[PDB]
Amino acid sequence: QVSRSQQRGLRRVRDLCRVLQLPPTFEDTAVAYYQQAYRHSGIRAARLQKKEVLVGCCVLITCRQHNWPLTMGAICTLLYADLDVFSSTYMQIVKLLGLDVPSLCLAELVKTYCSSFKLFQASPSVPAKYVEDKEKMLSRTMQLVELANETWLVTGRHPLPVITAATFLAWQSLQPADRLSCSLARFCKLANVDLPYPASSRLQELLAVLLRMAEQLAWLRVLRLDKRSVVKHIGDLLQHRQSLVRSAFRDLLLPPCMLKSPKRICPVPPVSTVTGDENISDSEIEQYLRTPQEVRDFQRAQAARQA
Amino acid sequence: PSGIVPQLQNIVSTVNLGCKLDLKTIALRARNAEYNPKRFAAVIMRIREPRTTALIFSSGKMVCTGAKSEEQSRLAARKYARVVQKLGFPAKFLDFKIQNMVGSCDVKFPIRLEGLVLTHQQFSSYEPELFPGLIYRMIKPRIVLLIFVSGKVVLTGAKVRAEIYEAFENIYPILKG
DNA sequence: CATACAGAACTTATAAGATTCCCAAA
DNA sequence: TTTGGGAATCTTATAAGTTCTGTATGA
Ligand SMILES: [Mg+2]
Ligand SMILES: [Mg+2]
């Protein structure tokens, strides 16, 4: 009695779970969500592309409930799906099934993403001086991501570029004498990970926050540190991050989109005297009409447009 | 009250001109008409005052966008009707109706969107992987609000100006507290 | 070959209508 | 097959912030 397009959908759900190497209990939850989804007319009668992304949606909802750090972009890459089609289908099905879906777990994403960075062993592309301890890396990156969240750098942004910037800063700060000459682009390349476009901005924001924190400590404030010289004091700054963040807010610390120069415009006044019932003169309308000469010049121009 | 009045940014209205229209004739004989029937079925028309855009269909139905007040929207829709009349069509002004109203303002303090999505979960949708704003679906009045970390708020879906004011007054203590 | 700036996609509401697409009962 | 019921495509406006193009200017 179960439809064919439904059977194909349920099979696709199980295959995606298996490919993603998800714990065994997730497959059953995701299958149940697709079945619950198919009971609604708008889903049953869904088109070719929405039917395909629906599989991914049900797997992502299941992952989000278990704090499995699967991003929307990563699921769309796997499925060769359009992010926007996935985006509208996800929002629709959550609303439809009346679910409260937990947000992406950042701590879980740091552990997973950071572990994929190929920096824990020396190779032709990774010199021995650039090799870092996995646990030291994860621990420092997690502290910098928590600092980014606390200092308004995470809210409204893509989460992965924050972790890229924080990983780089964690790595550099663990051996600063030899790693400050290496750029964010070179770091991603040796770690064999793609460079997200916003990672550069997140990096500069994170270095700016670490400088504001450095100003709360007398012995660091007298050093007149810059974005380059602050890197070797990151270990110290993270050790007292709770105290220094409390101190920095006490003395201005706002989301980066707020710290912008005010815009100068002359149409700010909203005063209008329009009633909607005023006379419409003939002269006011005639300016929107072509003259017989304009009509004739235009007609001639369109009479030669073909052959 | 907050002491903050949301500013109207856009008004969408509709009107029936009560007669069938030849869009090729309008596109040819008007200066302010854009018509690409392979891209979109309607004539796109623009008037300078009130600065607006209209979508004129062969059925005689019209959509008027861009006005900053309901009065400006009515005045503009009436001017488009008059342009159609002078082009030779027996145009009327039937069933003028405001379809949508967009308001905007600033609470001038930052918003922890990650906290608001937890406390007001049943109304909130916040997915930073997709869009920077929290989508707040207020039930009374039936208004969608887009809430940004900056404290800037977009209010939309209103049929009357009072629903924009009512929704912002309801949201302000939620954002303040 | 640096970076800098413009423009547009994403999100929300909303109407218009031809046309496609996908499922349902008859 | 025929009809019906939806949802989507194209387009218009507008605020908001982020992401990511495509282009252009001083070396
Ligand atoms: Mg419509
Ligand atoms: Mg904008």
XYZ file of C-alpha atoms (C1' of nucleotides) and ligand atoms in Angstrom:
539
model
C 0.000 0.000 0.000
C 3.099 2.263 0.489
C 3.795 4.345 -2.675
C 6.800 3.671 -5.004
C 8.237 7.265 -4.718
C 7.932 6.780 -0.899
C 9.756 3.360 -0.947
C 12.568 4.938 -3.056
C 12.671 7.868 -0.554
C 12.917 5.607 2.550
C 15.701 3.553 0.821
C 17.589 6.811 -0.002
C 17.290 7.904 3.694
C 18.917 4.604 4.886
C 21.734 4.852 2.277
C 22.552 8.479 3.255
C 22.725 7.442 6.992
C 25.106 4.520 6.075
C 27.362 6.713 3.832
C 27.541 9.318 6.675
C 28.552 6.432 9.098
C 25.907 7.584 11.624
C 25.246 5.510 14.792
C 22.646 2.685 14.132
C 19.660 4.353 15.955
C 19.652 7.459 13.602
C 18.470 5.524 10.490
C 15.120 4.526 12.194
C 14.424 8.107 13.444
C 15.099 9.635 9.960
C 12.908 6.959 8.220
C 10.047 7.734 10.685
C 10.356 11.527 9.913
C 10.156 10.914 6.079
C 6.994 8.738 6.680
C 5.487 11.485 8.949
C 6.390 14.054 6.200
C 4.761 11.986 3.371
C 1.359 12.144 5.225
C 1.081 15.863 4.207
C -0.348 16.660 0.688
C 2.268 19.373 -0.146
C 5.097 16.814 0.402
C 3.327 13.831 -1.303
C 2.807 16.041 -4.405
C 6.373 17.535 -4.176
C 8.466 18.015 -7.322
C 11.623 16.062 -8.400
C 14.224 18.292 -6.616
C 12.215 18.838 -3.363
C 11.687 15.011 -3.083
C 15.494 14.479 -3.261
C 16.427 17.148 -0.664
C 13.592 15.873 1.649
C 15.769 12.736 2.323
C 18.669 14.984 3.496
C 16.334 17.146 5.639
C 15.059 14.125 7.598
C 18.687 12.912 8.170
C 19.822 16.480 9.215
C 16.840 16.930 11.695
C 17.818 13.527 13.285
C 21.521 14.637 13.454
C 20.643 18.011 15.009
C 18.619 16.262 17.770
C 21.659 14.078 18.602
C 24.172 16.986 18.282
C 25.845 15.245 15.273
C 27.814 18.130 13.682
C 26.545 17.742 10.119
C 26.313 21.164 8.431
C 23.765 22.009 5.700
C 26.552 22.763 3.253
C 28.221 19.381 3.947
C 24.905 17.424 3.440
C 24.259 19.460 0.171
C 27.832 18.643 -1.108
C 27.155 14.882 -0.502
C 23.727 14.936 -2.137
C 24.844 17.268 -5.019
C 21.856 19.389 -3.942
C 21.087 23.108 -4.310
C 21.511 24.712 -0.865
C 18.473 27.026 -1.426
C 16.150 24.101 -2.362
C 17.470 22.242 0.730
C 16.998 25.500 2.795
C 13.271 26.002 1.879
C 12.451 22.234 2.201
C 14.149 22.049 5.670
C 12.287 25.178 7.000
C 8.951 23.802 5.574
C 9.260 20.251 7.038
C 10.326 21.508 10.594
C 7.247 23.856 10.592
C 5.059 20.995 9.233
C 6.096 18.300 11.803
C 5.895 20.889 14.662
C 9.449 20.160 15.838
C 11.866 22.163 17.927
C 15.150 21.347 16.232
C 18.317 22.041 18.262
C 20.856 24.404 16.720
C 24.139 23.070 15.212
C 26.448 21.938 18.051
C 29.611 24.058 17.632
C 31.685 22.089 20.173
C 30.971 18.851 18.243
C 31.864 20.603 14.930
C 35.223 21.828 16.416
C 36.092 18.201 17.431
C 35.136 16.774 13.986
C 36.412 19.591 11.681
C 39.683 20.153 13.701
C 40.447 16.323 13.652
C 40.284 16.355 9.763
C 43.178 18.927 9.637
C 46.200 16.823 8.431
C 48.781 18.440 10.850
C 49.456 15.648 13.349
C 52.153 13.939 11.261
C 55.062 15.258 9.134
C 54.807 14.706 5.321
C 56.207 16.349 2.115
C 53.416 19.005 2.441
C 53.656 19.260 6.292
C 57.199 20.112 7.610
C 58.043 18.754 11.135
C 58.052 22.381 12.584
C 54.331 22.707 11.592
C 53.221 19.435 13.205
C 50.996 20.013 16.196
C 49.596 17.797 18.974
C 45.911 16.960 18.252
C 44.704 17.385 21.889
C 46.569 20.716 22.386
C 45.044 21.950 19.073
C 41.430 20.911 19.929
C 41.646 22.343 23.479
C 42.989 25.770 22.324
C 40.574 25.991 19.255
C 37.580 25.248 21.537
C 38.626 28.096 23.884
C 38.953 30.570 20.900
C 35.509 29.486 19.447
C 33.942 30.002 22.946
C 35.710 33.435 23.031
C 34.251 34.247 19.508
C 30.739 33.293 20.709
C 31.069 35.417 23.866
C 32.345 38.501 21.948
C 29.512 38.551 19.307
C 31.560 37.131 16.391
C 29.411 33.990 15.848
C 25.806 35.420 15.864
C 24.348 35.681 12.329
C 27.498 34.304 10.630
C 28.364 31.007 9.006
C 29.847 28.864 11.839
C 32.622 26.921 9.981
C 34.733 30.056 9.020
C 34.898 30.935 12.797
C 36.394 27.457 13.504
C 38.844 27.833 10.572
C 40.060 31.199 11.992
C 40.198 29.817 15.594
C 42.111 26.585 14.473
C 44.743 28.719 12.662
C 45.142 31.004 15.689
C 45.346 27.985 18.022
C 48.042 26.378 15.786
C 50.092 29.627 15.370
C 49.950 30.454 19.131
C 51.250 27.015 20.164
C 54.592 27.672 18.335
C 54.586 31.445 17.437
C 58.311 32.000 16.614
C 58.022 29.703 13.508
C 54.297 29.936 12.618
C 53.624 33.722 12.386
C 55.219 33.808 8.895
C 52.552 31.300 7.680
C 49.299 32.803 6.304
C 45.719 31.509 6.813
C 45.694 30.351 3.096
C 49.020 28.468 3.507
C 47.774 26.890 6.790
C 44.533 25.547 5.152
C 46.554 24.165 2.216
C 49.037 22.211 4.372
C 46.188 21.043 6.723
C 44.506 19.972 3.395
C 41.188 21.787 4.054
C 39.345 24.343 1.838
C 39.670 28.011 2.786
C 36.151 29.395 3.554
C 35.739 32.944 2.130
C 34.689 34.513 5.585
C 37.653 32.893 7.548
C 39.907 35.998 6.861
C 37.304 38.394 8.407
C 36.710 36.100 11.386
C 40.489 35.966 11.918
C 40.857 39.781 11.964
C 37.828 40.064 14.357
C 39.296 37.420 16.700
C 42.733 39.212 16.723
C 40.929 42.542 17.452
C 39.048 40.926 20.422
C 42.340 39.398 21.786
C 43.904 42.901 21.616
C 40.985 44.445 23.630
C 41.492 41.670 26.230
C 45.309 42.336 26.296
C 44.474 45.984 27.294
C 42.867 44.704 30.570
C 46.292 43.409 31.808
C 48.796 46.150 32.815
C 51.948 44.143 31.723
C 50.433 43.436 28.235
C 48.947 46.976 27.823
C 52.447 48.586 28.205
C 53.757 46.369 25.267
C 51.453 48.271 22.760
C 50.651 44.938 21.015
C 49.412 44.648 17.416
C 47.645 41.791 15.589
C 51.034 40.092 14.983
C 52.631 40.558 18.429
C 49.460 39.528 20.351
C 49.734 35.904 18.910
C 52.442 34.751 21.455
C 50.297 36.056 24.379
C 47.141 34.030 23.287
C 47.953 31.189 25.737
C 48.069 33.740 28.623
C 44.919 35.552 27.379
C 42.909 32.306 27.136
C 44.030 31.245 30.658
C 42.180 34.316 32.047
C 39.459 34.600 29.277
C 36.418 34.617 31.685
C 37.979 37.437 33.837
C 39.319 39.470 30.835
C 35.963 39.308 28.900
C 34.040 40.469 32.077
C 36.640 43.307 32.450
C 36.408 44.309 28.710
C 32.539 44.567 28.815
C 32.744 46.572 32.133
C 34.893 49.363 30.532
C 31.740 49.315 23.751
C 32.127 45.503 23.048
C 29.440 44.990 20.433
C 28.722 42.862 17.292
C 31.093 43.920 14.451
C 28.161 45.130 12.182
C 27.291 47.788 14.878
C 30.811 49.318 14.982
C 30.398 51.152 11.671
C 30.521 54.857 10.668
C 27.027 56.516 10.605
C 25.489 56.966 7.127
C 24.744 60.479 5.812
C 21.417 60.833 3.925
C 19.067 63.807 3.193
C 15.702 61.851 2.786
C 15.614 60.850 6.566
C 12.522 63.173 7.198
C 9.376 61.038 6.549
C 6.890 63.998 6.396
C 4.281 63.639 3.617
C 1.011 65.537 2.981
C -0.395 62.948 0.452
C -4.108 62.030 1.052
C -4.403 59.716 -2.024
C -7.436 61.769 -3.239
C -5.575 64.685 -4.986
C -6.354 65.776 -8.575
C -4.325 64.102 -11.364
C -3.788 66.711 -14.088
C -3.594 65.764 -17.820
C -0.039 67.294 -18.043
C 1.129 65.022 -15.203
C -0.024 61.925 -17.183
C 1.011 63.084 -20.760
C 4.751 63.008 -19.739
C 4.488 59.140 -19.554
C 3.128 58.752 -23.107
C 5.098 58.554 -26.299
C 4.435 61.288 -28.915
C 3.207 60.179 -32.419
C 6.811 60.758 -33.643
C 8.345 58.553 -30.877
C 5.759 55.796 -31.680
C 6.722 56.077 -35.424
C 10.533 56.025 -34.809
C 10.084 53.032 -32.448
C 7.755 51.147 -34.935
C 10.315 51.616 -37.787
C 13.089 50.268 -35.462
C 11.038 47.112 -34.648
C 9.972 46.559 -38.321
C 13.649 45.930 -39.275
C 14.472 43.884 -36.053
C 13.555 40.714 -38.038
C 15.585 39.644 -41.172
C 5.869 52.302 25.298
C 9.333 52.046 23.641
C 9.276 55.576 22.187
C 10.348 54.044 18.824
C 8.029 54.381 15.791
C 8.678 51.813 12.945
C 9.098 53.574 9.533
C 7.103 52.282 6.529
C 9.469 51.176 3.761
C 7.234 49.474 1.218
C 3.497 49.165 0.398
C 2.095 46.538 -2.032
C -1.401 47.250 -3.357
C -3.655 45.756 -6.044
C -6.439 47.159 -8.255
C -8.655 45.908 -11.105
C -8.850 48.203 -14.133
C -12.054 46.371 -15.127
C -11.133 45.825 -18.779
C -8.868 43.558 -20.886
C -5.593 45.203 -22.001
C -3.316 44.828 -25.073
C 0.170 44.860 -23.417
C 1.947 45.222 -26.838
C -0.013 48.551 -27.337
C 0.870 49.785 -23.775
C 4.605 48.813 -24.254
C 4.672 50.657 -27.624
C 2.737 53.826 -26.747
C 4.017 54.445 -23.150
C 7.541 55.836 -22.250
C 7.716 54.246 -18.795
C 6.772 50.633 -19.862
C 9.033 47.567 -19.846
C 7.656 44.478 -21.537
C 9.488 41.192 -22.120
C 6.652 38.588 -22.483
C 9.168 35.672 -22.709
C 10.631 36.640 -19.294
C 7.467 37.846 -17.513
C 3.826 38.133 -18.709
C 3.127 41.653 -17.406
C 4.067 45.220 -18.400
C 6.428 46.797 -15.825
C 5.585 50.493 -15.493
C 7.254 53.219 -13.446
C 6.121 56.740 -12.416
C 8.425 59.277 -10.749
C 5.950 60.622 -8.175
C 5.100 58.851 -5.897
C 8.203 56.789 -6.887
C 6.669 53.343 -7.545
C 6.517 50.370 -9.934
C 3.384 48.677 -11.358
C 2.801 45.212 -12.879
C 0.045 45.527 -15.487
C -1.525 42.252 -16.709
C -3.594 41.575 -19.926
C -6.551 40.679 -17.603
C -6.709 44.320 -16.411
C -5.372 43.422 -12.917
C -2.535 45.548 -11.508
C 0.041 45.324 -8.657
C 1.550 48.610 -7.299
C 4.838 48.448 -5.240
C 7.420 50.774 -3.587
C 5.181 53.467 -2.005
C 6.014 54.613 1.599
C 2.356 55.185 2.688
C -1.083 53.654 1.924
C -2.096 57.145 0.552
C 0.951 57.269 -1.768
C 0.121 53.732 -2.951
C -3.491 54.774 -3.813
C -2.296 57.975 -5.572
C 0.279 56.002 -7.626
C -2.221 53.189 -8.572
C -4.655 55.967 -9.695
C -1.903 57.554 -11.892
C -1.146 54.148 -13.563
C -4.926 53.754 -14.177
C -4.928 57.233 -15.839
C -1.907 56.288 -18.055
C -3.824 53.138 -19.229
C -6.964 55.358 -19.871
C -5.035 57.848 -22.115
C -3.557 54.842 -24.060
C -7.152 54.119 -25.230
C -8.428 51.498 -22.750
C -11.716 52.016 -20.804
C -9.914 51.690 -17.448
C -11.715 51.924 -14.063
C -10.380 51.899 -10.462
C -11.960 48.810 -8.904
C -11.308 47.003 -5.617
C -8.186 48.992 -4.562
C -6.654 47.004 -1.702
C -3.435 47.162 0.359
C -1.902 43.659 0.217
C 1.341 44.048 2.222
C 3.152 46.627 4.398
C 6.831 46.582 5.393
C 8.103 48.555 8.421
C 11.604 48.919 9.923
C 13.261 50.308 13.064
C 16.208 50.016 15.525
C 16.109 49.130 19.282
C 19.803 50.460 19.466
C 21.130 47.520 21.575
C 22.548 44.122 20.414
C 20.401 40.927 20.361
C 21.617 37.462 21.440
C 19.735 35.669 18.585
C 21.046 32.290 19.948
C 19.252 33.063 23.278
C 16.011 34.398 21.740
C 15.621 31.227 19.607
C 15.701 29.224 22.918
C 13.363 31.413 25.056
C 10.810 32.137 22.239
C 11.312 28.882 20.361
C 7.621 28.426 19.307
C 7.772 31.722 17.258
C 11.460 31.730 16.241
C 13.538 30.339 13.393
C 17.279 31.172 13.426
C 19.616 29.323 11.014
C 22.881 31.363 10.615
C 24.101 28.843 7.917
C 21.180 30.237 5.774
C 20.457 33.892 6.882
C 21.764 36.283 9.673
C 18.342 37.179 11.052
C 15.990 35.428 13.386
C 12.567 34.961 11.680
C 9.916 35.666 14.341
C 6.336 34.635 13.420
C 4.086 36.652 15.730
C 0.551 35.220 15.888
C -1.127 38.352 17.307
C -0.961 40.355 15.096
C -0.052 37.920 12.237
C 3.331 39.583 11.464
C 6.736 38.235 10.460
C 9.686 40.052 12.065
C 13.326 39.749 10.973
C 15.508 40.427 14.035
C 19.218 41.105 13.587
C 22.139 41.038 16.058
C 22.445 44.851 15.555
C 18.971 45.395 17.075
C 17.563 46.457 13.685
C 14.115 44.920 13.077
C 12.120 44.389 9.835
C 8.332 43.964 10.200
C 6.264 42.580 7.341
C 2.918 41.020 6.335
C 0.614 43.817 7.517
C -2.630 44.794 5.755
C -2.921 47.940 8.019
C -0.222 50.253 9.562
C -1.536 49.519 13.132
C -0.394 45.821 12.835
C 3.251 47.042 12.294
C 3.056 49.266 15.434
C 1.229 46.526 17.469
C 3.883 43.870 16.517
C 6.839 46.182 17.363
C 5.312 47.127 20.722
C 4.831 43.403 21.509
C 8.440 42.520 20.493
C 10.244 45.447 22.264
C 9.899 44.008 25.898
C 10.953 40.540 24.582
C 14.123 42.120 23.083
C 14.677 44.484 26.075
C 14.129 41.817 28.793
C 49.198 41.320 -8.452
C 47.751 43.204 -4.553
C 42.858 45.163 -2.255
C 38.824 47.618 -2.774
C 34.452 48.478 -4.057
C 30.027 47.433 -6.466
C 26.243 44.413 -7.022
C 23.542 40.440 -6.002
C 22.232 35.989 -3.976
C 20.275 34.273 0.512
C 15.492 35.591 4.288
C 10.199 37.732 5.045
C 5.384 39.457 3.470
C 2.201 40.076 -0.846
C -0.613 40.343 -5.168
C -0.766 39.197 -10.347
C -1.385 34.627 -14.472
C 0.585 31.289 -17.953
C 2.585 27.197 -17.542
C 4.923 23.218 -15.655
C 4.966 19.452 -12.617
C 3.598 15.799 -9.480
C -0.128 13.243 -7.088
C -5.019 12.152 -6.398
C -9.917 10.293 -7.492
C -12.908 9.068 -11.144
C -7.212 9.739 -19.973
C -9.709 13.760 -17.706
C -10.209 16.873 -14.157
C -8.836 18.810 -9.807
C -5.603 20.434 -6.085
C -1.875 22.039 -4.940
C 3.287 24.191 -5.329
C 6.763 25.902 -8.061
C 9.079 29.014 -12.133
C 9.319 34.052 -14.180
C 8.558 39.584 -12.137
C 7.991 43.972 -8.731
C 9.280 46.603 -4.043
C 11.693 47.132 0.608
C 14.175 47.017 5.061
C 18.007 44.071 7.257
C 23.552 41.412 7.536
C 26.489 37.952 5.402
C 28.634 35.700 1.693
C 30.642 35.688 -2.556
C 30.888 37.124 -7.100
C 32.683 40.116 -11.031
C 35.166 44.112 -12.160
C 38.466 47.926 -11.732
C 42.246 50.922 -9.889
C 47.062 51.941 -8.334
C 51.758 49.023 -8.454
Mg 0.633 34.328 -7.066
Mg 19.508 45.028 1.362
